[PDB]
Design a protein around this ligand. Structure first.
Ligand SMILES: CCCCCCCCCCCCCCCCCC(=O)SCCNC(=O)CCNC(=O)[C@H](O)C(C)(C)COP(=O)(O)OP(=O)(O)OC[C@H]1O[C@@H](n2cnc3c(N)ncnc32)[C@H](O)[C@@H]1OP(=O)(O)O
Ligand SMILES: CCCCCCCCCCCCCCCCCC(=O)SCCNC(=O)CCNC(=O)[C@H](O)C(C)(C)COP(=O)(O)OP(=O)(O)OC[C@H]1O[C@@H](n2cnc3c(N)ncnc32)[C@H](O)[C@@H]1OP(=O)(O)O
Ligand SMILES: Cc1cc2nc3c(=O)[nH]c(=O)nc-3n(C[C@H](O)[C@H](O)[C@H](O)COP(=O)(O)OP(=O)(O)OC[C@H]3O[C@@H](n4cnc5c(N)ncnc54)[C@H](O)[C@@H]3O)c2cc1C
Ligand SMILES: Cc1cc2nc3c(=O)[nH]c(=O)nc-3n(C[C@H](O)[C@H](O)[C@H](O)COP(=O)(O)OP(=O)(O)OC[C@H]3O[C@@H](n4cnc5c(N)ncnc54)[C@H](O)[C@@H]3O)c2cc1C
Lengths: 607, 607
């Protein structure tokens, strides 16, 4: 087969044995979707991922897109084009999207499980083909006239981009200087240069591209609150039929050469700099740019974390496959006997430690993004968690920085173990883990760096939230921990919950203290990322133990064969994680409780 | 200037203010080298590394060597060949080499500090140019006839290789099947295929290459003990003048395609398979192969750890230079004020945490390999540490797994922080950190995987050694923590010593219990790598506090200006490491004390 190894069985286990998404199927907007329908779609898309989508994964990296400056055009490998069009011709880009746009209803938890397979097999495909998902947001936020455009965009299959960054405005989006001047007809003319734009051009892959652009109206206020969101197409088009017309003044002027994700054209995109106006329209005809754009960012941050996790999972499964078959060395128990038979390396304790660590974070993080996705539909959140719509929004907001920040960083860190499992062969392009690592590095940077995720998590999702969402998740873990074979694991989780609550209390103390000495805030920043990562380990631990309980019940009821091996692996991985990673949170709490500002007051030249 | 950023000042600090190498200079073999001569040499190689050597760093990766299968030859980029020849013409490969081979005396601590700059600027240069260091080993081990061959190899500038690995014999060197058949004329015919041979061919870069080859003499016993070391030249040569002659029967048949270190040709090397016998000569005319080859392996393991550390250093320095000039966002104390002045990112807490983390491991690991190198000369070890020659060998042996294993893994892990400091630009090939990471990942694999290092460290360097070397080093740390501003840090180091000593006790306990239940050994394997990493952190913490003590003295003695900034940085980094990384060892100890065999008993199919 291909490089991509899927795990539909684990997705089904989470969705329909552990998390309860099955109880929302057959109800609400999912009247005509049952568990069998969702299972079949998952198997169907996993086969597409493993075949036509994965087929161009290697070539996308080895023969990157070619950029021609004078026609401002990017040419993608033909094999990649077919991969994208194989996905689109099957309609996987439209599941969960409004029926007006050609979609059919589906819980986001299932949608993200479906898209996991695409993100694992060839993530850039998902990016180039996000047009309809972009159209969904434009449909939600636009005037009635702009809704017809969104409908057209979805059906003519346009490509799409999210356009915020400028050389001087990356983390600080509010510093952007791309400007917008209103025209007599109500149109606007966009004028500026944007940097690092994913899918900024894609050649003849699509009939059109509609950029969603942040720009500052002439005379607008400063910062992010002064930015407005604009619909700017590559081609002007017939507002009735969608037929592309005159080329609009939006041009790629450069394409970055990157560590990985090479098939995703990361572009310098110029608006109105080449003699042709960049005509655009104010989304919703209101000035509400940063709020509007964050509907896109929220999806971007979910995708990026799910991508990081999809990559770890297939990285782990490739390493496991290799390890079962690689003979090297003798069993440690027969070390003195140098004539002892050679064994497969899964017999070596460090290889099993490595593989169980990979397993725990692949499956642990899979559970985490699926659990997060059960809060992204109010109806699913209601039936699974018994929370009302407002609280579900708060919990999803709480969990997004965890999915993105912990997923990106832990996936990359544990792909190191995947590669280590192959020995020297892991350093070769013959195996895909090398590329997995290069493609995954980006996940801690774009859609907001980890430091921005951790700042958002504490200041916006806990402090501004008054801790409500965190107290809800904490309370669910408390109940789980207070409720035979899993008693030791639950006590380690009780300790980890207490450790994380002590982290949050210390950081809130630093926050409170800042009223007397404002530099106390630096301590919060110093601890923010370790706190973010600790919460992730806590929720991974809990979800894995919820899985282990379902597995114990399945084994007692007489599981046999492959199902028994699946459930046996869940008991072991939940216990392994509890004993090897949860106790580390104790030392981290002590460090966070002890933070000082020595390194803040240090002279910069001392570094 | 170039990508490579050096730190001569820190090397001097370690060598001549902390570690006491100055006491050995001016005496014994080092008559002709004083502190000043060494500082100038470090500065001189500093500049060669930054210029002619770093010149080809980028091209070597983006235009890798071309393999010609019909002539079994590798063609290296011309600019890279210039870099190698610039190193050789300045004689940096012969520093510390026997005078018979064109070298002059130099303590190993200074030699590795010299080579740090080549390894950071273009590590493959060091590898290709290592021929003279190979000859020194040939000179030590050879018959009188072979020592003349070693002289000619050093004088004619030949390249060299170390040839062990086969497809079925990587970590398990003893499974190699390359054969050796003695001829009437006293030579042997080598027959087999070797894999992954660094520098297996180099085109016209050198006049000859002498391969050091492990092979199994006809009728020898199994495992590493049945292997012998053979001298196998690319060209047969006149044994009096060294003039190359007939082509010997050893040919490269493939070159690997790798993640990084691309300009190092990693070759499939075939002996006696292309119709021409591969003539070789038994090194020392004795069958001591694995012990002889381990003289080479010990240098390779020191180099790999030093390379990884050299790479983290220039990664940190590049990120630091970038952080000081990158304007993004405002001070955290003004987060509510959206009009606040923009600041350089060095003002942000998470960036300073990141930078101080990179600093502590770059400088901590530099101290580690320099400390280790003070045991690689008997005269130096006596003057500096007061230990006899045989104990110095044992300590060096103890530390080689630390330098290679901990250096390789921690350098790669912390380069993630370096790249993160660049934000989105770190993912660009426009900056060198992307290449650092790819070039560094191999450090955890070749010259023995991290698991091999951890196994060697415990079973051979602690258990076979009867705790002598470990007891000596721990004794020095015990002394140190029992000796105002460094008091808090001293106590954290004491706790770390107790923690590591508890890890050792637990592992020794598991070893003893293997007398009754031999599976207990598996627990040793499970904790082996974490134990090794913990010792690294202990020794890093210790050395940084030794540096801090020296720095405090210099501060109170009236240091000013840039020297004051240097010394202040050492105080801060030693304290930061003590407070943020040493306490984490307590939880690691608890994990090691609670290891069990559940994941060993688990069915393979359950993974
Ligand atoms: C049915 C089907 C469904 C289909 C749809 C799904 C599919 C769609 C397809 C997805 C496409 C993905 C394509 C891939 C492209 C790659 C992504 C990128 O790199 S792209 C680029 C990625 N770039 C980045 O990620 C930017 C990174 N930088 C940051 O995030 C900064 O922290 C900053 C810019 C927010 C700071 O600015 P500063 O002015 O200090 O900010 P303040 O703190 O003052 O907040 C101001 C206002 O912002 C707002 N708002 C804020 N936070 C949140 C939130 N978390 N959350 C929400 N809103 C949030 C809020 O309105 C707030 O006002 P208020 O409510 O308070 O009144
Ligand atoms: C100015 C100078 C400028 C230029 C400088 C040039 C310097 C020189 C060249 C530098 C290198 C060039 C760069 C090349 C980079 C490629 C490096 C590689 O990958 S290639 C290398 C890649 N491949 C590897 O690294 C192999 C990795 N695999 C291993 O290490 C395995 O553990 C194994 C082979 C030892 C197992 O086999 P098994 O038979 O079960 O192991 P046992 O436990 O039973 O010991 C058997 C005998 O071996 C001995 N001996 C053992 N250990 C050590 C030691 N630490 N320590 C010492 N000796 C050791 C010992 O004699 C022992 O006998 P005994 O004393 O006990 O009676
Ligand atoms: C491959 C790729 C594709 C991209 N595609 C897109 C796209 O389609 N659309 C788009 O809009 N953007 C895109 N970007 C940009 C992306 O959104 C990133 O947010 C951007 O690269 C980050 O800003 P920067 O690179 O200027 O880094 P900076 O913001 O300059 O960050 C540099 C360092 O400073 C730290 N830092 C910065 N500000 C703070 C702060 N206030 N507190 C603490 N630490 C801070 C960061 O964490 C980081 O370590 C892409 C980037 C890449 C690499
Ligand atoms: C770039 C590069 C250059 C190289 N250059 C040279 C060279 O010049 N000369 C040379 O002789 N070799 C060279 N090698 C070979 C290199 O030393 C081997 O790849 C290395 O020893 C690992 O062997 P392997 O690839 O077969 O992995 P394996 O031995 O198959 O290891 C696979 C996995 O099993 C684990 N494992 C194996 N045995 C054990 C055990 N007993 N206990 C616990 N875990 C175990 C490993 O840690 C790893 O995770 C090079 C390799 C590379 C990648």
């Amino acid at each position: 087969m291909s490089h991509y190894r899927s795990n539909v069985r684990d997705q089904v286990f989470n969705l329909f044995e552990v998390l309860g998404v099955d109880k929302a199927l057959g109800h609400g907007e999912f009247s005509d979707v049952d568990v069998d329908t969702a299972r079949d779609m998952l198997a169907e898309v996993s086969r597409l991922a493993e075949g036509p989508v994965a087929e161009s994964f290697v070539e996308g990296d080895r023969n990157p897109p070619v950029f021609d400056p004078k026609t401002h055009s990017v040419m993608l490998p033909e094999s990649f084009k077919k991969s994208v069009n194989a996905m689109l011709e099957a309609g996987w880009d439209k599941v969960g999207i409004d029926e007006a746009l050609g979609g059919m209803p589906m819980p986001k938890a299932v949608v993200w499980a479906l898209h996991e397979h695409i993100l694992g097999a060839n993530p850039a495909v998902w990016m180039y083909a996000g047009g309809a998902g972009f159209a969904q947001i434009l449909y939600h936020l636009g005037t009635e006239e702009q809704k017809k455009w969104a409908v057209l965009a979805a059906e003519r299959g346009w490509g799409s981009t999210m356009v915020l960054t400028e050389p001087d405005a990356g983390s600080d989006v509010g510093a952007a200087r791309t400007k917008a001047v209103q025209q007599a007809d109500g149109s606007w003319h966009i004028d500026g240069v944007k940097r690092f734009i994913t899918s900024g051009d894609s050649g003849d892959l699509f009939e059109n591209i509609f950029h969603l652009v942040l720009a500052r109206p002439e005379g607008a206020g400063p910062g992010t609150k002064g930015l407005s969101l604009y619909f700017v197409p590559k081609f002007l088009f017939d507002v009735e039929t969608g037929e592309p017309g005159e080329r609009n003044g939006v041009f790629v002027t450069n394409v970055e050469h990157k560590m990985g994700l090479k098939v995703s054209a990361t572009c310098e995109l110029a608006f109105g700099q080449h003699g042709v106006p960049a005509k655009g329209w104010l989304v919703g005809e209101v000035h509400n740019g940063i709020a509007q754009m964050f509907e896109v960012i929220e999806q971007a941050r979910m995708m990026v974390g799910t991508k990081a996790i999809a990559t770890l999972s297939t990285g782990y499964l490739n390493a496991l496959q290799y390890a079962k078959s690689r003979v090297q060395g003798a069993d440690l128990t027969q070390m003195t006997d140098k004539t002892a038979p050679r064994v497969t390396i899964t017999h070596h304790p460090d290889v099993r430690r490595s593989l169980m660590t990979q397993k725990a974070y692949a499956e642990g993080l899979r559970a985490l993004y699926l659990y997060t996705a059960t809060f992204q539909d109010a109806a699913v959140a209601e039936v699974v968690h018994g929370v009302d719509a407002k609280l579900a929004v708060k919990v999803n907001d709480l969990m997004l920085p965890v999915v993105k920040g912990v997923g990106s960083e832990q996936a990359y860190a544990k792909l190191t173990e995947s590669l280590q499992t192959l020995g020297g062969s892991g350093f070769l392009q013959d195996y895909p883990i090398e590329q997995y690592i290069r493609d995954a590095k980006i996940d801690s940077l774009y859609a907001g760096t980890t430091a921005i995720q951790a700042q958002d998590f504490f200041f916006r999702k806990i402090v501004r939230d008054k801790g409500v969402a965190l107290a809800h998740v904490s309370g669910q873990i408390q109940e789980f921990v207070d409720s035979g074979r899993l008693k030791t694991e639950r006590a380690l989780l009780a300790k980890a919950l207490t450790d994380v609550q002590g982290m949050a209390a210390a950081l809130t103390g630093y926050l409170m203290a800042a009223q007397q000495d404002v530099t106390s805030l630096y301590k919060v920043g110093l601890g923010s990322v370790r706190f973010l990562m600790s919460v992730g380990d806590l929720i991974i631990g809990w979800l894995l133990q919820r899985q282990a309980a379902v597995a114990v019940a399945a084994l007692d009821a007489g599981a046999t064969g492959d199902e028994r091996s699946f459930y046996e692996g869940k008991v072991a991985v939940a216990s392994f994680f509890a004993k090897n990673f949860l106790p580390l949170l104790t030392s981290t709490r002590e460090v966070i409780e002890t933070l000082d500002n020595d390194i803040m007051e240090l002279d910069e030249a001392a570094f």
